[PDB]
Amino acid sequence: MGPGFDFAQAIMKKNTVIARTEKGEFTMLGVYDRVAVIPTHASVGEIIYINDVETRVLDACALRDLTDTNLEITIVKLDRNQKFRDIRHFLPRCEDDYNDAVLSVHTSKFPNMYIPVGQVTNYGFLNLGGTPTHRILMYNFPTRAGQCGGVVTTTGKVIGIHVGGNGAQGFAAMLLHSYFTD
């Protein structure tokens, strides 16, 4: 409907796949080459389904900060025959607050879903499903089961992936440029 939704759609159309693990179906953001991200609670194994195709996982790393605290982001390298468009130049370099964000989800349950979540707070610490977690973004929207891995964007930035909610608020893990240097 406007420039926020336009940027979100451009990311969804070229840089997302549907990932299935034994823990469910997730929106998965491709970042560059064969490297993608997913919430750590997806419990990625040696094999994953990518758009319902059996795919070997070449590498998977559950990120933690230097205090050894969960960040809830797993970086996955996929044995896929095609590279993602490189979107690393849309990733923020530092922790920040944002105005006017969109959360976008693409799964069998929620295809082509876009939610204007509004203001995004650098919340920091969250006890997420019992697990102490850092670098959490918060937005005041009643997100639900099925949105995990959803991409959070502003115009021109990809800022996070949805990892949970409490019924009134939703929470995303930050994406930072420094996670994807090579």
Side-chain angles (χ1 to χ4, degrees):
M1 266 198 173
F5 294 109
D6 192 40
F7 182 82
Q9 180 179 254
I11 298 298
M12 294 312 285
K13 282 204 202 307
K14 285 293 168 172
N15 281 80
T16 64
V17 297
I18 299 170
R20 173 176 286 283
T21 72
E22 294 180 328
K23 308 276 165 102
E25 211 176 61
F26 298 82
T27 304
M28 167 177 265
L29 178 74
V31 178
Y32 77 103
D33 292 354
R34 295 167 295 171
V35 176
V37 292
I38 190 170
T40 295
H41 71 256
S43 304
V44 176
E46 301 301 293
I47 299 174
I48 194 168
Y49 271 49
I50 301 294
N51 298 334
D52 278 304
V53 179
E54 192 184 6
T55 303
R56 288 186 290 270
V57 173
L58 299 173
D59 188 53
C61 175
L63 298 183
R64 302 183 71 90
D65 74 12
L66 296 181
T67 69
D68 185 32
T69 305
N70 179 51
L71 291 168
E72 202 50 25
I73 301 282
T74 292
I75 306 179
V76 180
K77 190 164 174 181
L78 300 167
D79 199 359
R80 194 147 184 267
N81 68 355
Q82 176 188 176
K83 301 179 175 66
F84 298 118
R85 175 196 186 191
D86 190 345
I87 55 167
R88 287 180 288 183
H89 59 286
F90 299 134
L91 300 175
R93 272 149 201 259
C94 64
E95 303 184 21
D96 211 349
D97 312 281
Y98 298 90
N99 298 316
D100 196 24
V102 171
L103 167 64
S104 51
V105 168
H106 188 86
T107 65
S108 304
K109 189 195 189 157
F110 293 140
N112 302 294
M113 162 185 291
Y114 302 77
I115 310 172
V117 298
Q119 268 190 30
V120 175
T121 301
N122 180 359
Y123 195 87
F125 171 90
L126 181 71
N127 189 5
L128 173 68
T131 299
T133 303
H134 285 167
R135 285 186 178 150
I136 290 289
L137 299 170
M138 181 274 289
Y139 29 89
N140 282 295
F141 189 90
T143 59
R144 307 214 208 91
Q147 285 149 208
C148 288
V151 187
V152 185
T153 59
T154 66
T155 59
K157 292 193 253 59
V158 179
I159 68 169
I161 63 165
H162 188 76
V163 295
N166 61 22
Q169 298 167 313
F171 298 104
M174 290 177 188
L175 290 169
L176 297 175
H177 184 89
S178 58
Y179 299 167
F180 303 101
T181 68
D182 65 38

